[PDB]
Design an enzyme around this catalytic site. Structure first.
Site, PDB file in Angstrom:
ATOM      1  N   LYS B  34       0.794  -1.225   0.000  1.00 30.50           N
ATOM      2  CA  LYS B  34       0.000   0.000   0.000  1.00 30.50           C
ATOM      3  C   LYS B  34       0.830   1.281   0.000  1.00 30.50           C
ATOM      4  O   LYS B  34       0.599   2.184   0.806  1.00 30.50           O
ATOM      5  CB  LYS B  34      -0.946  -0.006   1.205  1.00 30.50           C
ATOM      6  CG  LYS B  34      -1.860  -1.222   1.254  1.00 30.50           C
ATOM      7  CD  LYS B  34      -2.880  -1.116   2.377  1.00 30.50           C
ATOM      8  CE  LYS B  34      -3.880  -2.264   2.320  1.00 30.50           C
ATOM      9  NZ  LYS B  34      -4.952  -2.127   3.348  1.00 30.50           N
ATOM     10  N   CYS B  35       1.790   1.359  -0.915  1.00 35.57           N
ATOM     11  CA  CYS B  35       2.655   2.527  -1.026  1.00 35.57           C
ATOM     12  C   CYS B  35       2.569   3.094  -2.442  1.00 35.57           C
ATOM     13  O   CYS B  35       2.311   2.359  -3.396  1.00 35.57           O
ATOM     14  CB  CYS B  35       4.097   2.128  -0.701  1.00 35.57           C
ATOM     15  SG  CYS B  35       5.348   3.417  -0.957  1.00 35.57           S
ATOM     16  N   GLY B  36       2.772   4.401  -2.570  1.00 38.95           N
ATOM     17  CA  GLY B  36       2.721   5.027  -3.879  1.00 38.95           C
ATOM     18  C   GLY B  36       3.818   4.504  -4.791  1.00 38.95           C
ATOM     19  O   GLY B  36       3.742   4.644  -6.013  1.00 38.95           O
ATOM     20  N   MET B  37       4.836   3.890  -4.196  1.00 39.89           N
ATOM     21  CA  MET B  37       5.959   3.346  -4.957  1.00 39.89           C
ATOM     22  C   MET B  37       5.704   1.896  -5.356  1.00 39.89           C
ATOM     23  O   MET B  37       6.417   1.335  -6.191  1.00 39.89           O
ATOM     24  CB  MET B  37       7.241   3.402  -4.122  1.00 39.89           C
ATOM     25  CG  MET B  37       7.550   4.758  -3.518  1.00 39.89           C
ATOM     26  SD  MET B  37       8.998   4.687  -2.432  1.00 39.89           S
ATOM     27  CE  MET B  37      10.276   5.050  -3.597  1.00 39.89           C
ATOM     28  N   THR B  38       4.688   1.294  -4.749  1.00 47.14           N
ATOM     29  CA  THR B  38       4.352  -0.101  -5.016  1.00 47.14           C
ATOM     30  C   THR B  38       4.196  -0.458  -6.495  1.00 47.14           C
ATOM     31  O   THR B  38       4.862  -1.364  -6.989  1.00 47.14           O
ATOM     32  CB  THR B  38       3.057  -0.506  -4.272  1.00 47.14           C
ATOM     33  OG1 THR B  38       3.257  -0.377  -2.858  1.00 47.14           O
ATOM     34  CG2 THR B  38       2.682  -1.946  -4.595  1.00 47.14           C
TER      35      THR B  38
END
Lengths: 161, 160
Positions: B34-38
């Site tokens: 659940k990360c914007g970098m995922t």
């Protein structure tokens, strides 16, 4: 709020307003003359510069003697050394501290990059930072990552396919 | 010592002797779902895997919920997520801690890399490490360096 709010001294102790680099991507590197990584980093920086200087890339080299005392010379000895061994065409600035309370304001700003992800002390000689044309720091690399490993990101920032 | 002298748990809590990856270049990454970098990180890791798996590259993904609690699920939920959205084929290991008194021995070792230059705590989700075929850690990258930026070094390590 951007890298352009800073002023640093050149190799002759004269001020240089970083805003004069507006519109260019900045590869900021703390350098050292007596390091095992010296030859490869300067050489690879020369290659990147030749290939991208006319496309928007500018390289700022900041001597620093905080790592194993591998940059003990005076500004003149440092520049003379580079002038002799590498013939680098990118600017070499005044020696500075990158860590500690006397660390250059520029580096304090660089460390605030990307939500504080770049907060770590500079690990050793030749750490690298990339600043986009908007003047914001977008990438940081460990000293062990040679300049050529940054080409992909450099092209992205310069919008080169 | 080297990364090969370590043993970690897979998504099924079962032991895995990392020595089984000897002779292969390893890209070790701490992941989060659940990360914007995922999205970009998994997508690019897939690209690297497709191009270099057959050439000696192996990607070892270690889930970690120590950063903004962006990896809250169970191993089942994590692997489910990865599969449904990325259909990744590289090994996804058991969730671990990378910093702190409960940090995996592996990461404690990775941080000893290059004479202590890699000593910093993992900054955030998706930091990357490159290990040569002999199990020695030779490169480290900030979370912000997307997987494709490591290709030049991977190619050098694979001698291509």
């Amino acid at each position: 709020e951007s890298v352009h709010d800073f002023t640093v001294k050149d190799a002759k102790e004269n001020d240089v307003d970083l805003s004069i680099f507006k519109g260019k991507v900045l590869l900021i590197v703390n350098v050292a003359s007596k390091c095992g990584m010296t030859n490869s980093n300067y050489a690879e920086m020369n290659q990147l510069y030749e290939k991208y200087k006319d496309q928007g890339l500018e390289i700022l080299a900041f001597p620093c003697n905080q790592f194993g005392e591998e940059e003990p010379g005076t500004n003149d000895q440092i520049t003379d050394f580079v002038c002799t061994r590498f013939k680098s065409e990118f600017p070499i600035f005044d020696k500075i501290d990158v860590n500690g309370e006397n660390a250059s304001p520029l580096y304090r700003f660089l460390k605030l990059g990307k939500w504080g992800i770049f907060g770590d002390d500079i690990q050793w000689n030749f750490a690298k930072f990339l600043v986009n044309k908007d003047g914001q720091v977008v990438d940081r690399y460990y000293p062990t990552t040679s300049p050529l490993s940054l080409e992909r990101d450099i092209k992205q920032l310069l919008e080169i396919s």
